[PDB]
Ligand binder design. Structure first.
Ligand SMILES: Cc1cc2nc3c(=O)[nH]c(=O)nc-3n(C[C@H](O)[C@H](O)[C@H](O)COP(=O)(O)O)c2cc1C
Ligand SMILES: C/C(=C/CC/C(C)=C/Cc1c(O)c(Cl)c(C)c(C=O)c1O)[C@H](C)O
Ligand SMILES: O=C(O)c1cc(=O)[nH]c(=O)[nH]1
Length: 366
């Protein structure tokens, strides 16, 4: 390990967290990142970490999960941090405030967070203009193995969920390498019901028609982000719809409304989605299930509790082609990105994989 990793993890981050409420801390993190005020990213990505998936090259398989940069303000700073790809959002069609404060909570004893933001969003028009200001810069980044994802949500008061997602495809689709249909936020009433077979089929048919209507150079992959709290029936149904419609991939998983036995944080019974270590293995097992149900033919972005190279490799071996993290960044700071990549490379070598690609779904072939 490096000195930076230790300093951030043991001293700087815990000290700053002791001084700032979680939302203020988040806002400062976005601001600092957007301005490029970050420790020097020492880790050079090796060829072993390159993944080709979703019609793109990814320089490394470690991305920033949705919810950190909700409004597309810090994309370049996130690449500077060493992320192989950036996902922004969720973005709603109209601007909306989200829930009253406080709405984010740290569980330090669990290395977890609970949030109930409720899709606070600058809205499609603001984010569209923000991305347009760097659209050609992004085109070059994408070509150089650094793709951009855009995660779409729906407004609280909308009377037509499918039309909300359709508007997101039309407005932000042309600026994204991939789009995410987020039907798994636990913080918007009725949203998770869109994961049901009939609702999902209707919704995704509309989303895919809108995507297919975009010009070729502006036509993103479409992925669906799912909950960790689905029944076996729900998962079978999602896999069936994914295959029927030719959905490009899955993001597995969002936060959990479960509260695993053993949580110690004083704030464990706050309403919202739980992220970080207590989610890790629930997410891994959901990746494992979804990979098997889709016969390994549908790319999966694995997310939930990734804080180390071992966490990343477990999700990759379970069937993820790429991974994302968020909560680990909140505890360990920017050095966690290089840490995960360096550990992942070392483990791939130790386990006799030629690269990340060889390890994808390896557990299913044991
Ligand atoms: C504060 C916070 C805000 C989030 N906002 C979003 C969001 O807007 N859209 C989304 O799809 N996921 C959102 N997520 C979920 C993350 O993208 C990710 O699925 C989840 O936190 C698991 O990863 P982690 O354990 O590495 O944080 C959010 C998570 C947190 C902690
Ligand atoms: C350059 C940086 C300075 C960070 C200062 C700080 C105090 C971060 C903790 C933190 C939290 O405590 C919490 Cl609760 C959240 C949600 C977030 C959400 O992002 C979060 O970043 C970052 C590391 O990129
Ligand atoms: O905005 C939020 O509350 C939010 C959205 C989401 O998809 N996941 C999450 O944990 N929080």
């Amino acid at each position: 390990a490096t000195g930076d990793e230790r300093f951030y993890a043991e001293h700087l981050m815990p000290t700053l967290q002791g001084l700032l409420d979680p939302e203020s801390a988040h806002r400062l993190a976005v601001r600092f990142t957007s301005l490029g005020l970050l420790p020097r990213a020492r880790f050079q990505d090796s060829d072993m970490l390159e993944v080709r998936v979703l019609g793109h090259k990814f320089r490394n398989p470690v991305g920033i999960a949705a919810g950190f940069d909700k409004h597309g303000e810090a994309v370049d700073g996130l690449y500077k941090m060493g992320f192989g790809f950036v996902e922004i959002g969720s973005v709603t069609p109209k601007p909306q405030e989200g829930n009253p404060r406080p709405r984010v909570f740290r569980l330090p004893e669990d290395q977890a967070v609970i949030n109930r933001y409720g899709f606070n969003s600058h809205g499609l028009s603001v984010v569209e203009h923000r991305l347009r200001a760097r659209q050609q810069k992004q085109a070059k980044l994408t070509e150089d193995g650094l793709p951009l994802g855009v995660n779409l949500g729906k407004n609280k008061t909308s009377v037509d969920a499918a039309e909300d997602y359709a508007e997101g495809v039309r407005v932000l689709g042309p600026l994204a390498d991939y789009l995410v249909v987020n039907v798994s936020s636990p913080n918007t009433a009725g949203l998770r019901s869109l994961q049901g077979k009939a609702e999902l089929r209707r919704l995704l048919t509309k989303v895919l028609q809108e995507r297919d209507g975009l010009r070729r150079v502006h036509r993103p992959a479409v992925l669906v982000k799912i909950a960790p709290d689905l029944t076996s029936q729900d998962k079978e149904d999602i896999a069936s719809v994914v295959k029927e419609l030719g959905i490009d991939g899955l993001i597995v998983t969002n936060t959990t409304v479960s509260r695993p036995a053993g949580l110690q944080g004083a704030l464990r019974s706050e309403t919202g989605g739980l992220s970080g270590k207590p989610l890790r293995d629930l997410s891994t097992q959901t990746i494992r299930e979804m990979y098997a149900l889709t016969q390994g033919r549908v790319p999966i972005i694995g997310v939930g509790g990734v804080s180390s190279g071992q966490d990343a490799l477990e999700k990759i071996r379970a069937g993820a082609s790429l991974v994302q993290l968020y909560t680990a960044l909140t505890f360990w700071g920017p050095p966690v990105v290089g840490k995960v990549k360096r550990e992942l490379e070392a483990l791939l070598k130790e386990q006799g994989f030629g690269g990340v690609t060889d390890a994808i779904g390896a557990d299913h072939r044991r």
